[PDB]
Ligand binder design. Structure first.
Ligand SMILES: Nc1nc2c(ncn2[C@@H]2O[C@H](COP(=O)(O)OP(=O)(O)OP(O)(O)=S)[C@@H](O)[C@H]2O)c(=O)[nH]1
Ligand SMILES: C=C[C@@]1(C)CC(=O)[C@]2(O)[C@@]3(C)[C@@H](O)CCC(C)(C)[C@@H]3[C@H](O)[C@H](OC(C)=O)[C@@]2(C)O1
Ligand SMILES: Nc1ncnc2c1ncn2[C@@H]1CC[C@H](COP(=O)(O)OP(=O)(O)OP(=O)(O)O)O1
Ligand SMILES: [Cl-]
Ligand SMILES: [Mg+2]
Ligand SMILES: [Mg+2]
Ligand SMILES: [Mg+2]
Lengths: 331, 189, 189
């Protein structure tokens, strides 16, 4: 038996990361080329935070005027073709990352475009700077590289074949998805649950979660996917909780309807899960369920899964649950 | 037998942006998937012929991803020219629905002219109905030198459309390969 | 199902020949629509006959553009020679049509070999057609051809097994597509 799976979702939801888990879980020289990519994430993270400091409203100020010179440094090398990455770079970066100002600006990072692996790479600069540095499994999971075009990945789970297709989720990329709609076992739609207080890169205005909802509706009601079921991955479950519990960015300030929402009865919280968190994650799921409820009865269904793509441990659990849905339904 | 007509309205509607979208890779089965989308497009266009208002339209053929049709092969006396334009709008309605489901931005570019043509079959192989003449050559030039999301018509054609209540704009005077300098218009949506 | 059924099938090891009249829009301007369709028919009838003798399958006829592919429907390792032989006869045929008619007809022959997708599209007015990057190239070899001779790609020369004498084509300097794609052309003698 062979299953062809297509990953759909907006830009940065977590699609490419899901394929990296399939490799780590069911598939497995090249690890040395990813270093260059990891260092880029670091560079892009530091400069993006620093450059944003003066543009925010109100502008955030450094706590140590000494770092003003390091700020000048980061910027002077911002758009340098091939950066050789000298030992100074890491030093300046580290000092900046420790300045309260640069940190305060990071807390309000939802107001400008910042990569998800920021806090993770900046926290281990002292590790990446070594010449004998070898990227960990978790390092590759966090590493970010834009997807452009379509990519196939073949793997096996108990002598049963699976063909995975990874596509770009950015607006301009969506136009290639059509190439995979015909003869698809089921769809894996990925969403960035934690991105309720952010805006998309394409226009800098459309709410990220709203872009997700609209896109889901476009996929659920598509004329060529009338009988294809959708496995919904409510990804980035870790950042959702951290945001809810921190209470800085309120969910009802973006989606007003939250104020008139109570946790469902059938709700199954995690052992040691805060009531606030539970109520939040189930709310986001219900939004997508309201769409799937209204149409295509009996012909196709939707199966929600709480997900954290960079948790190699979590993905095994939910992928085995998917393997269940696929076999149990004769797809 | 080959019949002659005096007033036939020919039309060519292209999708310039397709040639770029088409690519041959292992994922898309050597470009088969791209052809699957064209088959959907050409099919949606075809079913407009079943509408009562379009009963006078004749699909001649399909050149590449260019849809060729003509009205007046069955013969407000010039309504058949005004109808062909109505069909042009309909193809846009259809192409836009395809865009909504394939997450694309394909736009139609139309060219319409009218005049005497010669209907009939040709050759020794298959019985394939086709129309010839200068009228058809110019229609095709009206499409190849057009603008996306615009219906480009010839001068004579512009007059007739205006009588029927249509409005037009002067594209200018452009040299058409082989024909020389023609003055052309753009139908106003 | 969800996608309209698609009657298309892939095919490797085939040859695609394209032919086109030079200055046809110009010719349709000089003589009456009747005489044009007649002189155009006198030519194509002979071509269609030659197509059977040379084991080629004629595809379509778009105005003055004529194309047929060898190696279809049944696979033929003799393919590339069929198209060359087809063009050979074509040229003489044009010579005689120009002779008895007194009409200035000349054609460009463009051949290329590779894979091809084939079948039909849409719902109404089906016509067997072919599509693929290689088909697109054969068409450009004709546009970038030299009037009166047979322009072929290196891919086609490799299926000829050294049976025809050729010369440097220089297709890169006569057509933008052939240059930008680094195509090495040749002209048969
Ligand atoms: N903390 C956390 N980070 C995550 C999670 N899922 C993905 N990320 C991180 O988000 C970033 C973007 O994920 P990625 O999978 O590259 O996006 P994408 O959907 O593939 O993006 P694209 O190629 O369509 S443009 C990566 O750095 C990845 O590690 C998650 O559940 N938690
Ligand atoms: C559908 C895509 C693609 C690339 C496939 C293809 O080979 C073509 O269909 C040919 C070459 C090919 O089908 C032979 C006929 C003709 C009429 C010469 C075509 C057009 O030039 C198409 O382009 C246009 C402009 O419609 C083109 C090039 O389009
Ligand atoms: N029945 C038809 N079906 C399809 N296309 C047609 C038909 N009749 C004419 N055409 C088209 C539109 C114009 C085109 C012929 O002109 P073409 O573009 O080949 O130029 P041309 O012959 O003047 O010069 P050249 O070929 O040398 O560039 O063929
Ligand atoms: Cl998303
Ligand atoms: Mg990706
Ligand atoms: Mg010509
Ligand atoms: Mg031509």
């Amino acid at each position: 038996a062979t299953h062809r799976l297509l990953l759909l979702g907006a830009g940065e939801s977590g699609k490419s990361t899901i394929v990296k888990q399939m490799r780590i879980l069911h598939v497995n020289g090249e690890k040395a080329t990813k270093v260059q990519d990891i260092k880029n994430n670091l560079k892009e993270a530091i400069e993006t935070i620093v450059a944003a400091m003066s543009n925010l409203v109100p502008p955030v100020e450094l706590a140590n005027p000494e770092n003003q010179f390091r700020v000048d440094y980061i910027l002077s090398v911002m758009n340098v073709p091939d950066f050789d990455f000298p030992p100074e770079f890491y030093e300046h970066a580290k000092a900046l990352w420790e300045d309260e100002g640069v940190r305060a600006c990071y807390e309000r990072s939802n107001e400008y475009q910042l990569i998800d692996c920021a806090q993770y790479f900046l926290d281990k600069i002292d590790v990446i700077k070594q010449d004998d540095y070898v990227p960990s499994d978790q390092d590759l999971l966090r590493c970010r590289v834009l997807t452009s075009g379509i990519f196939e990945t073949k793997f096996q789970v108990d002598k049963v074949n699976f063909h995975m297709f990874d596509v770009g989720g950015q607006r301009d990329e969506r136009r290639k998805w059509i190439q995979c709609f015909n003869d698809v076992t089921a769809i894996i739609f990925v969403v960035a649950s934690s991105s309720y207080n952010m805006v998309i890169r394409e226009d800098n205005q459309t709410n990220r979660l709203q872009e997700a909802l609209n896109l889901f509706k476009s996929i659920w009601n598509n004329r060529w996917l009338r009988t294809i079921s959708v496995i919904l991955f409510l990804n980035k479950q870790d950042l959702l909780a951290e945001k809810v519990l921190a209470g800085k960015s309120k969910i009802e300030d973006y989606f007003p309807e939250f104020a008139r929402y109570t946790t469902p009865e059938d709700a199954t919280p995690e052992p040691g899960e805060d009531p606030r968190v539970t109520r939040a994650k189930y709310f986001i799921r219900d939004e997508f369920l309201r769409i799937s409820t209204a149409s295509g009865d009996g012909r196709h269904y939707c199966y929600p899964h709480f997900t954290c793509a960079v948790d190699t441990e979590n993905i095994r659990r939910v992928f085995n649950d998917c393997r269940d849905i696929i076999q149990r339904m004769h797809l | 037998y080959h019949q002659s007509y005096d007033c036939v309205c020919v039309m060519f509607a292209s999708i310039p942006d397709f040639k770029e979208f088409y690519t041959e890779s292992d994922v898309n089965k050597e470009g088969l998937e791209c052809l699957r989308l064209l088959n959907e497009i050409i099919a949606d266009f075809d079913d407009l012929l079943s509408k009562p208002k379009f009963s006078g339209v004749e699909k001649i053929k399909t050149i590449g991803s260019t849809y060729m049709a003509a009205t007046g092969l069955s013969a407000r006396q010039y309504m058949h020219i005004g109808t062909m334009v109505e069909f042009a709008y309909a193809l846009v309605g259809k192409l836009d629905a395809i865009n909504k489901h394939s997450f694309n931005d394909f736009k139609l570019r139309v060219g319409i002219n009218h005049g005497p043509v010669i209907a009939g079959v040709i050759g020794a192989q298959k019985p394939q109905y086709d129309i010839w003449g200068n009228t058809v050559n110019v229609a095709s030039r009206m499409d190849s030198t057009g603008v996306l999301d615009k219906i480009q018509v010839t001068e004579e054609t512009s007059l007739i459309l205006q009588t029927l209540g249509y409005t037009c704009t002067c594209r200018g005077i452009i040299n058409v390969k082989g024909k020389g300098d023609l003055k052309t218009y753009f139908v106003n949506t | 199902m969800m996608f309209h059924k698609i009657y298309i099938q892939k095919h490797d090891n085939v040859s695609i020949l394209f032919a086109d009249i030079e200055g046809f829009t110009s010719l349709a301007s000089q003589c009456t629509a009747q005489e044009l369709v007649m002189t155009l028919n006198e030519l194509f009838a002979r071509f269609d006959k030659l197509a059977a003798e040379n084991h080629c399958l004629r595809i379509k006829i778009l105005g003055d553009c004529y194309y047929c592919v060898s190696g279809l429907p049944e696979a033929r390792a003799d393919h590339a020679h069929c198209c060359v032989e087809m063009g050979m006869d074509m040229i003489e045929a044009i010579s005689l049509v120009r002779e008895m008619t007194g009409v200035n007809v000349n054609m460009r022959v463009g051949i290329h070999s590779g894979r091809v997708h084939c079948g039909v599209l849409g719902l109404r007015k089906w016509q067997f057609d072919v599509w693929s990057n290689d088909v697109t190239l054969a068409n450009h070899m004709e546009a970038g051809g030299k009037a009166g001779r047979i322009h072929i790609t290196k891919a086609t020369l490799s299926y000829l097994n050294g049976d025809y004498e050729v010369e440097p084509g220089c297709g890169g300097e006569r057509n933008a597509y052939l240059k930008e794609h680094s195509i090495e052309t040749f002209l048969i003698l």
